[PDB]
Amino acid sequence: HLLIRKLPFSRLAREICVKFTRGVDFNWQAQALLALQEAAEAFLVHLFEDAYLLTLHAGRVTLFPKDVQLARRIRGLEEGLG
Amino acid sequence: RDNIQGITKPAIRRLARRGGVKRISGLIYEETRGVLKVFLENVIRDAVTYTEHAKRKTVTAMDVVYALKRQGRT
Amino acid sequence: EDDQLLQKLRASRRRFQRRMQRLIEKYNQPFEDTPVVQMATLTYETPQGLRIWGGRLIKER
């Protein structure tokens, strides 16, 4: 089911995590790491779906950063208006 | 930031496929990496500070869930 | 394809929402007796021994 390799992912999460813990590495439940990764993947896949609809809407089939950028701004409006 | 670069191109491609994306610019890789960092920063911050709030030293799945609910609302 | 765009965006958002709510319900439990990853080293105890998280077993018990 998982698409990102867990190791590189957990190194990243650890790097980010340490900024908040005074240079001390908090340990993580294995299930906290999986929860985090599943959630990040769900997020990126959703963003890709949204972005791609814009691609198809532009008349394209190739996804560009501008499509992603634009899907972020639209999620932001959804979140802000609704 | 040698670690975000550890998130590989094939991983990014699989994620995009899962999203229904047939093709990508090569520029999509960094774009995606940058988006992932911002996501993980928001969520991890809430997760750990919650663990700390509870006077614990181990981040649990329930801590992550609290953070997802927070970022959800927001 | 503009009217159809919005409709697809609405559908897309909903799938995400359902999916996040399934994730939240699934992970909102203690998992009291599950392995803790030692983040300093990115390793954890398995029945097999000491393993690298997402990686190879490094010490055999």
UniProtKB/Swiss-Prot annotation, chain A:
Transmembrane segments: none annotated. The keyword Acyltransferase does not apply. GO terms for cellular component: CENP-A containing nucleosome; chromosome, centromeric region; condensed chromosome, centromeric region; cytosol; nucleoplasm; nucleosome; nucleus; pericentric heterochromatin. Belongs to the histone H3 family. Its main location: nucleus. Ubiquitinated. Interaction with herpes virus HSV-1 ICP0 protein, leads to its degradation by the proteasome pathway. Methylation is low before incorporation into nucleosomes and increases with cell cycle progression, with the highest levels in mitotic nucleosomes. Residues 17-58 are annotated as: CATD. It is found in: Nucleus; Chromosome, Centromere. The keyword Nucleus applies. Component of centromeric nucleosomes, where DNA is wrapped around a histone octamer core. The octamer contains two molecules each of H2A, H2B, CENPA and H4 assembled in one CENPA-H4 heterotetramer and two H2A-H2B heterodimers. CENPA modulates the DNA-binding characteristics of nucleosomes so that protruding DNA ends have higher flexibility than in nucleosomes containing conventional histone H3. Inhibits binding of histone H1 to nucleosomes, since histone H1 binds preferentially to rigid DNA linkers that protrude from nucleosomes. Antibodies against CENPA are present in sera from patients with autoimmune diseases that developed autoantibodies against centrosomal proteins. The modification Phosphoserine is found at S10. The CATD (CENPA targeting domain) region is responsible for the more compact structure of nucleosomes containing CENPA. It is necessary and sufficient to mediate the localization into centromeres. The chain holds residues 59 to 140 of 140 of the full protein. One of its GO terms (molecular function) is chromatin binding. One of its GO terms (biological process) is establishment of mitotic spindle orientation. Keywords: ADP-ribosylation, Cell cycle, Cell division, Centromere, Chromosome, DNA-binding, Host-virus interaction, Methylation, Mitosis, Nucleosome core, Nucleus, Phosphoprotein, Ubl conjugation. Signal peptide: none annotated.
UniProtKB/Swiss-Prot annotation, chain B:
The modification Phosphoserine is found at S25. The keyword Phosphoprotein applies. Keywords: Acetylation, Chromosomal rearrangement, Chromosome, Citrullination, Disease variant, DNA-binding, Hydroxylation, Intellectual disability, Isopeptide bond, Methylation, Nucleosome core, Nucleus, Phosphoprotein, Ubl conjugation. It is found in: Nucleus; Chromosome. The modification N6-(beta-hydroxybutyryl)lysine is found at K9, K55, K69. Core component of nucleosome. Nucleosomes wrap and compact DNA into chromatin, limiting DNA accessibility to the cellular machineries which require DNA as a template. Histones thereby play a central role in transcription regulation, DNA repair, DNA replication and chromosomal stability. DNA accessibility is regulated via a complex set of post-translational modifications of histones, also called histone code, and nucleosome remodeling. Belongs to the histone H4 family. This is Histone H4. It comes from Homo sapiens (Human). The chain holds residues 24 to 97 of 103 of the full protein.
Curated annotation (Swiss-Prot), chain C:
It comes from the Eukaryota. Signal peptide: none annotated. Coiled coil: none annotated. According to PubMed:17256767, highly expressed in the thymus with lower levels in the placenta, small intestine, liver, skeletal muscle, and colon. According to PubMed:17823411, highly expressed in testis, and at a relatively lower level in thymus and bone marrow. Significantly overexpressed in many lung cancer samples, compared with normal lung. It is found in: Nucleus, Nucleolus; Chromosome, Centromere. Interacts with CENPA (via CATD domain); the interaction is direct and specific for CENPA since it does not interact with H3.1- or H3.3-containing nucleosomes. Heterotrimer composed of HJURP, CENPA and histone H4, where HJURP interacts with the dimer formed by CENPA and histone H4 and prevents tetramerization of CENPA and H4. Identified in a centromere complex containing histones H2A, H2B and H4, and at least CENPA, CENPB, CENPC, CENPT, CENPN, HJURP, SUPT16H, SSRP1 and RSF1. Interacts with 14-3-3 family members in a phosphorylation-dependent manner. Interacts with MSH5 and NBN. Centromeric protein that plays a central role in the incorporation and maintenance of histone H3-like variant CENPA at centromeres. Acts as a specific chaperone for CENPA and is required for the incorporation of newly synthesized CENPA molecules into nucleosomes at replicated centromeres. Prevents CENPA-H4 tetramerization and prevents premature DNA binding by the CENPA-H4 tetramer. Directly binds Holliday junctions. This is Holliday junction recognition protein. It comes from Homo sapiens (Human). The lineage of its organism: Eukaryota, Metazoa, Chordata, Craniata, Vertebrata. The gene is HJURP.
